Each structure stands twice: as C-alpha cells, then as structure tokens.
C-alpha cells in the first residue's frame, strides 16, 4: 500500500506500507482513503516497524495510535538518536529486548571485519584564510572542498580500484559532490535524479568490472539494497549524527573490508568526527589515525600545482547564496 501499483490491499493477510502515508495531515486519495478506512477497522497481529530509531517524530508517533495492533515489533540497526527521544520509545513500543554484540558477531566470521580508519588532511593555506575569515555558515563548503582531502580521496579511489575493490563514496553537500564527481568522471547520485536512473546505476554497479565506484549524497543513509562493498570513503557528512555514521558502516559489513573517513584538521570537522564515533567505539570499533599516505607523490593527482588550487577559491566562493 504505497500508491504505486495498488495490488488490491483490501482483504489481505500481510500488508506492507510505509510511514508518511498513514499519518497524512492533508486530503488523501480516494482509493487511499478507502484503503485506510478498511485498514482502521480490524485488529493487527505483530505490527512490524522498520527503522524504529526514527519513530519518535511529530507525525510518526501518532501512526502507532492511528492503527490498532496487539504486538508492536520494532527493528533497527542504529538505535542511537539525538534529542534524547529514545527514552520515549521505551513506552511508545516497548523495552529494548535484544542488542547484538557486534564484536563477537564479526568474530564468528559472518560479519565482515571492517578496519575502521579516521585519516585527516591538513588545510591548504589558500583555504584556511577564508575558513577563519568567514563565520556565517559559509565555511561548510570550505573544508569540504579541501584540495588535500581531494587528493587523499583520489589516491584511495585509485589504489582500491587497482586491486579491484568495490567502493561506495558517501558525501553530503551535493553542491560540493557535483564538482567532486565530475572531476573524476565517475557516476554519482544527486538524489533527486529519477527512480530509474538510480536503480540502473546501482544495478550495473555490482556486476561490472569496468565501473566499481559510485558517489552517494545522503541517499544511502537508510536501508536500501546496495550491493556488497569493501571500501567506504565518507567526506563532509552531517554534523554529529552517530546514526548516519553507524548506518554507513552498516552498508559495508555483510580484514575482509575497511572504510575510511576523511576530515580537515583545525576545523569543526575534527570535533564532529570525534563526537560521532563515540557510538562505534562503544560497539567495540577502534579508529586508527592516518596522517601520512604512502606514495602520495608516486603518481600524479589532481590539484598538483597551486594555480588550480587558487582557482578553486573563486568557484568555491561563487556560491554567495544571499
């Protein structure tokens, strides 16, 4: 029941739908209205909720009260959430039943032993002056488009492609991701592209040796059907969302694999990365700090000279969204 095929939801044993449709605050579709009227007239056994962590919302909570069910079973992988609304989930649904021990889970070999990495790059002088000069929230793009971080990401991409490893590159701030992906001429998901284009890109991502690296803009921050990947490189993620980082780490496991996080020194990204890894260290993961990359000057990388690095300043300051 998602207003896409309408496979006669009336008179069904198991019904599968999504949020934001059972709690509509506006006028509803006639067929959808009739389906909801039918659905609100009978009891439900074992109402299953997915991604329960984002249950305590303004409209998602009343979804529990808008339908009647006997048992409410919630499933999630990242129970961590800000705004301390997880306590509300104790009485909204029930108590925390089971919490898997990830360390012993990966010790059995059924979960990939991901070697977590936290490697930072120094801020180029052409960028740090502008970073310390501006404070009105325009510095988000500055450390995001750090030339040193760009070189590190390109080096990691090339190294892992040379050994035939599937790579997923997470990157928020899709504006930066545009010039981050078109520079290397690699597929990227802007996010409001289409439904078909994303599906075919992800479908040909796995069974193709020619292309094995993609860029994602906050779209992979949920439970999707992304294929198996061994390398994850996140750049300029959200502020302090431990849930987002835990989900991104969850997209790799299924040292079989390893994921890297790139941050800029002497910036808010350092504090953000420090405060958003406290969930995984409680889970047992340790983030090794990498300050030097072997063979950085062995091959040619982008932004080799200062000319294009200083040219990047004009285009990164060209936003002027006022």
């Amino acid at each position: 029941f998602t207003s896409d095929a309408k496979d006669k939801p009336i008179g069904c044993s198991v019904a599968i739908s999504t949020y934001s449709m059972l709690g509509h605050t506006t006028k509803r579709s006639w067929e959808a209205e009739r389906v909801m009227e039918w659905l609100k007239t009978q009891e439900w056994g074992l109402m299953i909720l997915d991604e329960v962590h984002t249950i305590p919302a303004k409209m998602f909570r009343r979804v529990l009260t808008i339908v009647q069910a006997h048992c409410k079973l919630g499933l999630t992988a990242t129970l961590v959430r800000e705004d301390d609304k997880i306590v509300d989930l104790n009485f909204l649904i029930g108590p925390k039943l089971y919490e898997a021990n990830w360390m012993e889970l990966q010790n059995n070999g059924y979960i990939a032993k991901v070697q977590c990495a936290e490697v930072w790059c120094p801020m180029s002088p052409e960028f740090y002056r502008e970073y310390v000069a501006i404070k009105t929230k325009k510095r988000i793009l500055l450390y995001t488009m750090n030339p040193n971080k760009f070189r590190a990401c390109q080096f990691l991409i090339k190294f892992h492609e040379r050994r035939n490893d599937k790579i997923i590159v997470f990157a928020d701030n899709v504006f930066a991701l545009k010039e981050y992906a078109i520079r290397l001429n690699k597929p990227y998901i802007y996010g409001p592209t289409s439904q078909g284009e994303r599906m075919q890109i992800l479908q040909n991502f796995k069974h193709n040796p020619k292309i094995n690296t993609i860029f994602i803009s906050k779209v992979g921050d949920t439970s999707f059907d992304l294929p198996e990947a061994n390398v994850l490189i996140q750049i300029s993620s959200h502020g302090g969302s431990r849930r987002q980082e835990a989900q991104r780490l969850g997209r790799v496991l299924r040292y079989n694999a390893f994921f890297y996080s790139l941050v800029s020194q002497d910036t808010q990204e350092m504090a953000y990365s420090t405060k958003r890894q406290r969930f995984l260290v409680d889970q047992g993961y340790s983030f090794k700090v990498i300050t030097k990359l072997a063979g950085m000057e062995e091959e040619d990388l982008a932004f080799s000279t200062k000319e294009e690095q200083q040219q990047l300043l004009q285009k990164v300051l060209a936003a002027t969204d006022l």
Partner: protein
C-alpha cells in the same frame, strides 16, 4: 499422500505437495462446490494434470451424484497420451495404497486413422479418405447384405463386435488407445466401435477440441452423456482462435473444379430425391460468378442469401435441408469412397451455415495470392467473427467449465471475448528453492538507439546492427541453444540477409550453429532434429523461428534445450487480408473492446506462449529476454502472466545490451550450483 482438504481427503501419488498445487486444489474444490464456470492459470505443464485428476477422483468418490462424466480436452495427441499415462500411474498408486479395484473406465478418443486395425488403410496418408473407406467397408447396407453372406472384401470387425462386443462391458480398467487397439485386434472388434459403445458406461474420457467445438461431430459424440458434467480445457490460451477456425471455411479454384468434375459422375450414377438432384446442379454458377468478377471485397452476411435468391431465385428454406440430406441421399447412392467428394460436402456445409448463422459473421473475397497476387485466385472465406458461437453449446450443457493454461494473464478480457461468467479470477505463481527464470527487457543498444521492431524501422540499418550485436554477444554467455522468435518470416529473412551482408553473422556462426525454420514440415523436422543433436554436445546452436508458426507450440524446450529465449520485437499480426479488422470492428461495436487493447493482448499472449515453453519441470531453468523498448511500457508488462511478473524487477526494464549480458552471465553462473527437492 492423503491431503486433507476442508471437507475431504484426497490421495496423491507424490508425498511432497507444493503450495501452488495445494492452493490450486483449494480453488478447484471451491469452484466445484460453487456449481459454476471459471478460469484458472498455472505455470507448470507437468504436475497440473496429476492434481486435477486426483481432485476429480476425490470429488467423484465424495459426490457420485454431483459429478458423473469428466472431459479433459487437450490440444494434440501427445497431451492425450501423457494424461492417459498419468491417470494410469494415479490408478496404480491408488490400487497399491488401497488394495481393491474400482469400477472406473478411462479411454482416449482420436480419429479413425489413429484407431484402426486394417493393414490396407494404415499405410496411406489420406485423412479425408480413411473415414470414407471405413464407411464403404462397413455400414448399414453392409450389415443388411451380410445376412446373405456376400463374397466380397469388407471389414469384419463390426460383424463380430455387434454379436459379441455389445454384451460384455468393461466396468474396470482404464485403457489407452494402444490398449483399445490391442483389445480390438485380439477380440476381432473395431476399437472405434467399442469406444462408442463404452463411453456411456465410463467414468472419464479424453479427446481433442475438434470433438466439441465442431458442431458436426460434438452432437454425435456427446448428445445425452451427462447433463451434469465437468469439462476442462487445459492449455487453452488460444481457445478463441480455434473456436473461430471451427466455423471458418475457404474456397478456391480447386474446390469448384473438383465439384464440377464429380457432379458429372454423380449424375451418371443417378441416371442408372429429385428435390435435390436438380437443386445441386445450378448452385455452382452463383459462386463461380465471383470468380469472373474482378472486385476487391464484397461483404454482405445477411444480403448474401438475398443475392442468391435473385440470380437463381431459390428459397432459403431448402438450404436447411441440405445437411440432413447428406445422411439420407448419399447412403442411397452407395458412394464407393469419399475421395473426390469432400468439396461437395463442404459446399453444403457452407450453404447451411450461411443460411442459419449470419448474425455475427462476414463474407470475404480476396483476389490476392503470395508472390502471384493477380493471375487467377479469388478466395472466398466465410470467416467467423465471434468466439461465443462455438462456446455456447458447452456452456449451456455443462456446469463447471474451466479454462486453464500457462498464459491467461488478463482475466478480464476472456470473460468478455466470449460470453462467460467467471467466479474465480485465480492466478498462481510457482516457487522453488531458487529463481528458475530471469526475465528482462532490453531497450536501447550500446548506441543508445531503440531496437523496437517498428514497421517504419524494419529496413533501418542501426536496429538490425544492434540486433545482430545482441545475438552475437548473447550467444557467448548462454550455452547449448538459444531460441529466437521474430515477428514474421519476411522480417526474419530480411534480417538474416542483412546480417549475412555484413561481416557479423560469421561471428555468431563460429560460436553457435544457426538453424532457420521454414514452412516445409519435413525441412522443419530435420532442422529441429539436427538442432537437438547439436545441442546434445558442446557445439551449441541457435534456433530462429517465428512467434506465429507451427514450431512455436509444436515443441517444448525442456531443460538443456534453449536456455535463452529471445523475443525480437513485439509480435504483431499483419493487419492485412481484411480479416483482423473485421474482428476488431465486431469486438468494438459488440463487446466494446478497444482495437489497440485487443492487438496488444494478442501480441503479448503470443509472446508469453512462445516464451513460457523454456520452463518445464521444477529443476528446469532458463533465461527470457525481450528485445524491444515497447515491452517496457506498463500496458504490455501487465499482460504478462503473474508467474513471470514478480521476477521482472524494475531494475532491468530498459537496460542496454552490455548490462543485459552481464545480468545473464551472473544468473547463469549462480544457477549452476546444486540445489534440494
């Protein structure tokens, strides 16, 4: 084993029951309790028959009064023999699990050629003369003259059956056609005559569609057998086509020449009643008038008799006496054989049909021929237009007619194509331990150009190059046989000629052997045999054919035969001949059927019928590809059977050739691992 349905227990030869079979049994029991008709859809040719027979036997045991006679009409003789042997296996299982016999009789019916013991008529290959020779050898006059024991060669099986086979019945023992022939030859009886005598005291019987859809024989074979009976038409996705062809006749120069040749002999025999002797003589010239008239088309189903009553001024009533004349006058003339006589009978049948049935028909005359259009060929065909005409006598005489096949995806068009009142609307999708089929629709090629089989782009070079490249790089990933279907023979030959012109067909040849299906039956048979023997070893081969051909349904591509089935474009029937358009108009103004909707339904029905023959059996697996962007639209995907819809993910609906090849490689690589039962 013993399956416990909600109000009965049914013995099943196989201990393990798939959920699809259980749901099918549930639905069929519901229909039988509903005392009404219905339509079903199953994806397996095998395993449906055993479940159907088991449920029928259980229902007969539970309710002997409700069900008395069973009909399992099928398409051809192999289906008849396989269902007979399946019933034999079921009966043997019941006997070994129960220990006592039951008075159930099961026989198979076919043509007199199939069931005959005279060695003087078997070697000949004349299906229109075997019945005539059988009638000449033994008939009412033969029985009358046998009293004096005339010394002349005649069939003697009946002369012994009428005195010895009309007293001993066959209460128990289901008999196959070979069993019937053996019993007849050991008892000196005709298998056909004992079959006729034994149908009354019988439990089940199987035969072809022609014994029920054709009114000229259904009444003789089924008149008062059982008022309350159950009939099922398995594999009847093309029931409308055969129903239309049942009341369809054709006329050519050969028919009229044969009639004018044989009427002189008939008159010579006569001069050695009068209401028809002079009546038959002048009928030929009215239809020969259209031979000398050079007109494109004449349509007048009601006014044809009006025009007949003008040139010769003949009443319409005596036409209705023509058919009943066949059994009366001819037997008085003592016809030696039906050779050189069938066109005269079919002319009378046509006259009776046009005299009686003219409400939903059309008369068409075509002065066109293949490669010799206008020399001398006015073909008159009394093509039927409504499929309900051939289906009324079975709906009004039966209670729970069931139409089931492997492709009945639109359940809303069959109840309105023919007058029908379904109460089921039931579909079933087979499930196994692994996905046995990987359907996918290939849109634009590597050049980002659509490969649609559009009429305006049939001669386009780019689409032909893309088709050739797809067939080449596909032939190297799926081994031991690929079955490709084209729209028509003309398009197929024009495509292969273009491929031969370029240096591309050699690349396919060096990978797999290419075999082309032609109209010749012997050539097609030998091509199929050599394709099978080439696919037996590692050579591999490609079988190129047409969707609307006798090879599409004549053979089944079981596992290891045709791992991939390719559809080169949506198969659309040719709009010419002014026959399809008449049916479209009739459906538009009568059943409110959209012309485009019906064309799409027919195209997708043929495509699914010719693509679903690659999966026969649970262990069988195969690949199915559609090489046309037009398949990508929902209006055509929705016409695919439900057991293929769920496996056609939205990810692969418009993917290019390279990604389709990659998907095929992954599917074949992952499907080769052992699975358990």
């Amino acid at each position: 084993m013993k399956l416990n349905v909600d109000g009965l227990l049914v013995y099943f030869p196989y201990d393990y029951i798939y959920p699809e079979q259980f749901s099918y049994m549930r639905e069929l029991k519901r229909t039988l309790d509903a005392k009404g008709h219905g339509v079903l859809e199953m994806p397996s040719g095998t395993g449906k028959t055993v479940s159907l027979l088991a449920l029928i036997m259980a229902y007969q045991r539970a309710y002997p009064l409700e069900v008395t006679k069973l009909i399992y009409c099928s398409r051809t003789v192999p289906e008849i023999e396989k269902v007979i042997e399946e019933l034999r296996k079921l009966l043997n299982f019941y006997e070994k699990q129960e220990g006592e016999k039951l008075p159930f009789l099961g026989l198979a019916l076919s043509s007199r050629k199939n069931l005959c013991i005279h060695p003087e008529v078997t070697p000949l290959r004349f299906g229109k003369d075997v019945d005539g020779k059988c009638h000449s050898l033994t008939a009412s006059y033969v029985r009358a003259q046998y009293q004096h024991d005339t010394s002349l060669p005649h069939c003697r099986f009946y002369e012994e059956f009428d005195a010895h086979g009309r007293e001993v019945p066959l209460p128990a023992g289901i008999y196959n056609l070979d069993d019937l022939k053996a019993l007849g030859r050991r008892q000196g009886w005709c298998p056909y005559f004992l079959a006729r005598y034994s149908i009354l005291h019988a439990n089940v019987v199987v035969y072809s569609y022609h014994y029920l859809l054709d009114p000229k024989i259904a009444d003789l074979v089924s008149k008062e057998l059982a008022r309350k009976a159950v009939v099922v038409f398995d594999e009847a996705h093309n029931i409308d086509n055969v129903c239309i062809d049942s009341m369809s006749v054709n006329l050519t120069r050969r028919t009229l020449d044969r009639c004018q040749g044989n009427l002189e002999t008939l008159q010579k025999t006569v001069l050695r009643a009068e209401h028809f002797l002079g009546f038959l003589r002048r009928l030929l010239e009215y239809v020969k008038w259209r031979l000398r008239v050079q007109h494109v088309v004449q349509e007048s189903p009601p006014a044809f008799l009006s025009g007949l009553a003008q040139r010769v001024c003949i009443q319409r009533k005596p036409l209705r006496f023509c058919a009943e004349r066949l059994r009366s006058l001819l037997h008085t003339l003592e016809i030696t054989d039906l050779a050189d006589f069938s066109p005269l009978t079919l002319l009378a049948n046509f006259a009776t049909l046009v005299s009686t049935y003219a409400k939903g028909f059309t008369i068409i005359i075509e002065p066109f021929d293949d490669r010799t259009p206008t020399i001398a060929n006015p073909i008159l065909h009394f093509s039927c237009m409504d499929a309900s005409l051939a289906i009324k006598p079975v709906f009004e005489r039966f209670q729970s007619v069931i139409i089931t096949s492997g492709t009945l995806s639109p359940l809303d068009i069959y109840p309105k194509i023919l007058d029908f009142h379904p109460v089921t609307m039931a579909t079933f999708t087979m499930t196994l331990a692994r996905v046995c089929l990987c359907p996918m629709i290939i849109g634009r090629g590597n050049d980002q150009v659509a490969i649609s089989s559009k009429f305006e782009t049939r001669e386009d070079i780019a689409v032909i190059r893309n088709y050739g490249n797809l067939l080449l790089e596909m032939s190297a990933v799926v081994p031991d046989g690929i079955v490709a279907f084209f729209t028509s023979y003309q398009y197929m030959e024009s495509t292969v000629a273009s491929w031969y012109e370029q240096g591309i067909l050699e690349n396919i040849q060096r990978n797999k052997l290419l075999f082309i299906e032609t109209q010749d039956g012997a050539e097609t048979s030998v091509a199929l045999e050599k394709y099978q023997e080439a696919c037996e070893n590692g050579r591999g081969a490609i079988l190129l054919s047409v969707a609307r051909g006798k090879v599409s349904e004549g053979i089944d591509f079981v596992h290891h035969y045709g791992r991939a089935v390719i559809m080169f474009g949506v198969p659309y029937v040719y709009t010419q001949s002014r026959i399809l358009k008449a049916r479209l108009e009739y459906l538009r103004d009568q059943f409110q059927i959209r012309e485009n909707d019906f064309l799409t339904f027919d195209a997708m029905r043929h495509a699914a019928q010719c693509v679903g023959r690659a999966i026969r059996g649970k262990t069988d697996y195969g690949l199915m590809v559609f090489a046309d962007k037009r398949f990508a639209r929902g209006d055509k995907r929705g016409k695919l059977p439900r057991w293929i819809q769920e496996h056609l993910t939205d990810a692969n609906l418009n993917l290019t050739v390279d990604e389709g090849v990659q998907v095929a490689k992954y599917f074949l690589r992952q499907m080769a691992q052992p699975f358990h039962r």
